Amino acid sequence: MFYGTVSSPDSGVYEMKIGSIIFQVASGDITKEEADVIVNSTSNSFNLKAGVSKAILECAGQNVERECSQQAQQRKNDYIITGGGFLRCKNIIHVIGGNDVKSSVSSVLQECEKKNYSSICLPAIGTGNAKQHPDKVAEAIIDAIEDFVQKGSAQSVKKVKVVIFLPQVLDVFYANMKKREG
Numbered sequence: 001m002f003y004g005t006v007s008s009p010d011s012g013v014y015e016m017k018i019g020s021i022i023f024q025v026a027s028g029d030i031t032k033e034e035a036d037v038i039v040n041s042t043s044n045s046f047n048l049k050a051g052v053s054k055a056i057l058e059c060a061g062q063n064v065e066r067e068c069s070q071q072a073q074q075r076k077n078d079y080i081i082t083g084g085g086f087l088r089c090k091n092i093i094h095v096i097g098g099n100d101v102k103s104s105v106s107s108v109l110q111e112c113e114k115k116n117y118s119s120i121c122l123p124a125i126g127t128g129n130a131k132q133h134p135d136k137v138a139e140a141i142i143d144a145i146e147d148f149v150q151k152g153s154a155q156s157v158k159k160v161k162v163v164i165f166l167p168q169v170l171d172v173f174y175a176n177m178k179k180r181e182g
């Protein structure tokens with residue numbers, strides 16, 4: 001009803017259509033990517049500096065770190081939106097790695113529509129310090145995008161890319177795409 005065909009547009013990159021959205025996966029360093037939004041997978045205090053969160057906060061810079069701690073003390077947040085700092089993006093959305101991954105991705109998609117953004121890049125949310133299982137994380141990410149498409153909510157959002165630290169986790173995402181393809 002929604003899924004296109006899995007193919008490889010460049011070496012190590014795999015893509016398929018989900019409704020109107022191009023969904024892509026690749027292994028690499030997320031801090032070198034360009035997108036309207038980059039997603040950080042962090043702790044409930046928004047000040048973790050381990051694994052992918054270390055790279056994102058170090059590259060983004062101290063003003064973004066400052067933004068995070070200030071919003072954390074203002075209220076209880078399920079996620080926080082900051083500037084991009086020295087990353088190549090318009091905003092960073094910082095989600096909690098231990099939270100429900102489908103819910104976190106659904107929130108990212110809705111916030112990107114609110115800003116009329118077209119591109120998103122995210123890590124394998126929850127597979128770092130939170131130690132959620134890669135198979136469940138892949139299923140949750142793709143389920144969130146399917147639901148967003150099914151509800152007719154995709155308007156500005158055109159491209160969602162997962163850039164993944166470990167090649168072994170990329171294999172799990174590829175297998176999930178092949179399970180779903182038309």
Ligand SMILES: Cc1cc(Nc2ccc(O)cc2)n2ncnc2n1
Nearest residue numbers: 028029050051052053054055128165
């Ligand atoms: C050991 C390790 C390293 C690393 N990131 C990285 C650092 C330096 C490079 O040159 C390449 C990748 N990450 N990210 C998440 N967990 C990690 N664990």
Ligand SMILES: [Cl-]
Nearest residue numbers: 097126128130
């Ligand atoms: Cl995590």
Ligand SMILES: [Cl-]
Nearest residue numbers: 123124164165
């Ligand atoms: Cl990752």
